[PDB]
């Protein structure tokens, strides 16, 4: 369970290549003498497949992923490879598929099996009367919540270790699409020593298991034969591939057996076969695909670092008003860049409420107002959503959904006089509460008791507009703070100023995606020789084709050049004559992609010969190709 085998030799996971492995039957449709294509999880030709061992010097049990599709090719001569382990993370946290073979039946159970660190099989008591009977079963630990159980036909498998070369080949195809498990199997006698053959074979399905679970990691089970860490294995090999959603050609005979497969993405010789949907291709030049240059960078330019709102003059002014008769400043037609206010290092009291400050820059609000006033330092907490006091209920009431900020700084040497500053006033008493964002400049005499005031003072008649008290020799927190309240509001009106334009630097002279303030698309920004107008934005062609752009505040005229595109024509010989092909793209050059430049494109794969011969394969512009010794 937790004890691992100490007979493991360290080896790096080297890779190898296959020739035509990974082709199976995609469906159960019987066809005769046709060549049709299909799109499924296939193993592409000349792929980097793994190179593992199943011997006693190097005994390794690696874990490979499963979500990308794998191909399982394994050679066997002494019945060492028995089954496999399927699961999500190789644990008993969920249901897992386990298909084992104890030489009697094919046990396929879907339970919550407790997988160990290194599960393996072993045969014990090889002294007298061995008979190759298994005794140690260390595959799983427990079983709970089973949903499927299948028992195959009983048989007898000889577990005797055979000597010599390989005798059997067991190649499997494992895939999982939307929980529907599919298993392909193939068995054929072979004669191998170390590696996989360079041949072709097809696979047939055996059973269908509609389980409905996801498999991400898997591990191959191996058996050992020892004559708990001194177990020795036999002699076997197994390769793990990687499936890709490719398209192959299926050459059907009169019996429906695939004899050869053609990849449409391996070599340009085989790409011509997928166009004509046949194996025998005559001498000539045919189109295979289309060339296209993918963009690698998005282009977003700026208009200028100017046209900013005066945050250094509004939020740093000298003359302000009172808390009840404050001056409301209108903010419109600017760029609300808050980069100079967050790291200004000049505000002793800087706090924001409501939401995150990163969300305020990515979300645009409608009403952006500034409420600046000078108050004392005892009731600064009352400027907050959900507060009570002489400011939030008598001077300046804030709504509960306040997402603004509070900006203040030390002004002990600016708004403080010796003897008391009586320039600003504040409301003390009121008959009731206020409204959110409400101005009250009334001079009504408050009546505390039952005695009427009649506009003048008297018994229980105090003046509500009292004066502030400022002192330079007062406390360090009771200094007058020039609090500038920034109001935020989101309504059905269109938003005006919340810093809309956020971009960066731009590149040019590449196949990129330009995105300006008035034109977007895809094109190469090359040099131009035209003459533009200072109020224009871009230019178009006759038949509605954008082919020119202009910088906002830079004297630079650029055109919209299309990238390298066009069809892919491959010159291919006959199937029984030669196999050398050339790469020829249309409407390109030999710089943006045996190299020669023609009028139709760049010809790569043909050596230029000054001798003029007979035109056998046409290319274009008086250039032809031939097959010389």
């Amino acid at each position: 369970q937790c004890v691992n085998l100490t007979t493991r030799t360290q080896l790096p996971p080297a890779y190898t290549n296959s020739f035509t492995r990974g082709v199976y039957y995609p469906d159960k449709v019987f066809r005769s003498s046709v060549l049709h294509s299909t799109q499924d999880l296939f193993l592409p030709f000349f792929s980097n497949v793994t190179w593992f061992h199943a011997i006693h010097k190097r005994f390794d049990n690696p874990v490979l992923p499963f979500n990308d599709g794998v191909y399982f090719a394994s050679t066997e001569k002494s019945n060492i490879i028995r089954g496999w382990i399927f699961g999500t993370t190789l644990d008993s946290k969920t249901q897992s598929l386990l298909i084992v073979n104890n030489a009697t039946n094919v046990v396929i159970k879907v339970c919550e099996f407790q997988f160990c660190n290194d599960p393996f099989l072993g045969v014990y008591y090889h002294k007298n009367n061995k008979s190759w009977m298994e005794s140690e079963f260390r595959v799983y630990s427990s079983a709970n919540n089973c949903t499927f159980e299948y028992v195959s036909q009983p048989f007898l498998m000889d577990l005797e270790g055979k000597q010599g070369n390989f005798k059997n080949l067991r190649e499997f195809v494992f895939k999982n699409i939307d929980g529907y498990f599919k298993i392909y199997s193939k068995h054929t006698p072979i004669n191998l020593v170390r590696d996989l053959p360079q041949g072709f074979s097809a696979l047939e399905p055996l059973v269908d298991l509609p389980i409905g679970i996801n498999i991400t990691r898997f591990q191959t089970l191996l058996a050992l034969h020892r004559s708990s860490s001194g177990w020795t294995a036999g002699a076997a090999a197994y390769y793990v591939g990687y499936l890709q959603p490719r398209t192959f050609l299926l050459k059907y005979n009169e019996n429906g057996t695939i004899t050869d497969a053609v990849d449409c993405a391996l070599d340009p010789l085989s790409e011509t076969k997928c166009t004509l949907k046949s194996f025998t291709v005559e001498k000539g030049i045919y189109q295979t695909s289309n060339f296209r240059v993918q963009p690698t960078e998005s282009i977003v330019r700026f208009p200028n670092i100017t046209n900013l709102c005066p945050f250094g003059e509004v939020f740093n002014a000298t003359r302000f008003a009172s808390v009840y008769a404050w001056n409301r400043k209108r903010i419109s037609n600017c760029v609300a860049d808050y980069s100079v206010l967050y790291n200004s290092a000049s505000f002793s009291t800087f706090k924001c409420y409501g939401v995150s400050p990163t969300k305020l820059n990515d979300l645009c609000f409608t009403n952006v107002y500034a409420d600046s006033f000078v108050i004392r330092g005892d009731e600064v907490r009352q400027i907050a959503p959900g507060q009570t006091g002489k400011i939030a209920d008598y001077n300046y009431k804030l709504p509960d959904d306040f997402t603004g900020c509070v900006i203040a700084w030390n002004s002990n040497n600016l708004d403080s006089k010796v003897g008391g500053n009586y320039n600003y006033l504040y409301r003390l008493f009121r008959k009731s509460n206020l409204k959110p964002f409400e101005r009250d400049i009334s001079t009504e005499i408050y009546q505390a008791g039952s005695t009427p005031c009649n506009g003048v003072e008297g018994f229980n008649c105090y003046f509500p507009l009292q004066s502030y008290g400022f002192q330079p020799t007062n406390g360090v927190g009771y200094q007058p703070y020039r609090v500038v309240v920034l109001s935020f509001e989101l309504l059905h009106a269109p938003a005006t100023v919340c810093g809309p334009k956020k971009s960066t630097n731009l590149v040019k002279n590449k196949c990129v995606n330009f995105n300006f303030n008035g034109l977007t698309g895809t094109g190469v920004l090359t040099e131009s020789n035209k003459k533009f107008l200072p109020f224009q934005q871009f230019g178009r062609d006759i038949a509605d084709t954008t082919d020119a752009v202009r910088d906002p505040q830079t004297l630079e005229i650029l055109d919209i050049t299309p990238c390298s595109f066009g069809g892919v024509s491959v010159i291919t010989p006959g199937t029984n004559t030669s196999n050398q092909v050339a790469v020829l793209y249309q409407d390109v050059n030999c710089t943006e992609v045996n190299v020669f430049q023609t009028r139709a494109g760049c010809l790569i794969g043909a050596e230029h010969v000054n001798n003029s011969y007979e035109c056998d394969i046409p290319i274009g512009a008086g250039i032809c190709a031939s097959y010389q010794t």
Partner: antibody, heavy 118, light 108 residues
């Protein structure tokens, strides 16, 4: 400048807390006086403050429960808590806040434990 | 109130290495970022005020920076006397809202 707490450690409910955190190292000339309790499990909560000039301002959560005074004669301060309950059992800390030479200074005490139980 | 949300509740470091405590505040406090220094068995003490000036008696091995919300206290050349619980808070106005808490562990 290091403060030191003093007083009883058992106060019955529906009574008045009477603690004393003295000041040693700096005379009462300019600064403030804070009082922050410490819940068991590394949790803090502000209670109130009072300036050295004679201005009182309390927290909006605990309006009539926080009553902190000052005494500039013996360089000591009193800590009173109105309407005590079982949830007020915490580690009380006394702190001060004063400025000087354009710098920010914040000193604390030593630590005391008060448990309210009937 | 200002909620000073932290990333981790306990961190460990060795003598001579560099440690960093990430405290992402949900509300904007600007450059007014304060830090504490709590010896075990004693009261906390002021360590870093206004995120750019150290306290009197503190060596220059404690640095700090940030922009908006991503505030990370950089502690280099950790010694045996650096055993303290660094707290992130704000000193804008009363009340002084404090954070959750991070306990530093010194390896030797």
């Amino acid at each position: 400048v290091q403060l030191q707490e003093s007083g009883p450690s058992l106060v019955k409910p529906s009574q008045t807390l009477s603690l004393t955190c003295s000041v040693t190292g700096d005379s009462i000339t300019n600064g403030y006086w804070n009082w922050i309790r410490k819940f068991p499990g590394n949790k803090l909560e502000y209670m109130g403050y009072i300036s050295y000039s004679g201005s009182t301002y309390y927290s909006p959560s605990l309006k009539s429960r926080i009553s902190i005074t000052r005494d500039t004669s013996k360089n000591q301060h009193y800590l009173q808590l109105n309407s005590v309950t079982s949830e007020d059992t915490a580690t009380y800390y006394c702190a001060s806040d004063y400025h000087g030479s354009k710098y920010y200074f914040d000193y604390w005490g030593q630590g005391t434990t008060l448990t309210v139980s009937s | 109130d200002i909620v000073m949300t932290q990333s981790h509740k306990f961190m460990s470091t060795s003598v001579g290495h560099r440690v960093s405590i990430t405290c992402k505040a949900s509300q904007d406090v600007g450059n007014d970022v304060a830090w504490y220094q709590q010896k075990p068995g004693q009261s906390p003490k002021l360590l870093i005020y206004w995120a750019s000036t150290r306290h009197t008696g503190v060596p220059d091995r404690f640095t700090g920076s940030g922009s908006g919300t991503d505030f990370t206290l950089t502690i280099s050349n950790v010694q045996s006397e650096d055993l303290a619980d660094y707290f992130c808070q704000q000193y804008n106005r009363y009340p002084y809202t404090f954070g959750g808490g991070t306990k530093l562990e010194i390896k030797r």
